[PDB]
Amino acid sequence: DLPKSVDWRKKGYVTPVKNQKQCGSAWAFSATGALEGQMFRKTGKLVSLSEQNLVDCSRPQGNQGCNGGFMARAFQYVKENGGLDSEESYPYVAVDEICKYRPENSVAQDTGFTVVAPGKEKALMKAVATVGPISVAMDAGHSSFQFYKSGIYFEPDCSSKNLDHGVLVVGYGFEGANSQNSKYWLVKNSWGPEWGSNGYVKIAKDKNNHCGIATAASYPNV
């Protein structure tokens, strides 16, 4: 039996909201967000991880830095590489640069990753409730998303299969008193704390996989 609502931010699994600025690296922020929660689950220590390390070093795994990428390829790089540096030691500059991965500054590892069945929102609910934050892709290509402010986000022109933006599901919940009505996914974005609701968005949940939230979800195995 899964809980009626989950919010990993209230348990110390989530770093403050970051900002990718003018670089298509949301895939990297989604990936660091998920690894941050799994390393916290493992050691009890919350340590911000380096998106720039992923931008600069994971081209061999199929990512293209500020030109886009995929969270699964990022978890694959961390596995193959044997580590990932901290935000502090390998700072974010939002441009493609030379790979300067330093093993002595690594604060995270993974052995691969687990995938949630494509399009299965209840499989994603189970992953969120039992594992921690989950990396997901969504269709964020709309002005309504760009100017989102509060409430449950629902966009008619949203696609559940052609996705363009990586984010992190940190929980789920509902509004009102009926735990099965007007449900939503709690999602951390990487456009800074100033965007949306303190950097977060509530996306309609159990409404036919709105915006593709459960189409390509995964988490790193630590």
Partner: peptide, 4 residues
């Protein structure tokens, strides 16, 4: 060229 993927997610951005």
């Amino acid at each position: 060229t993927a997610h951005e």
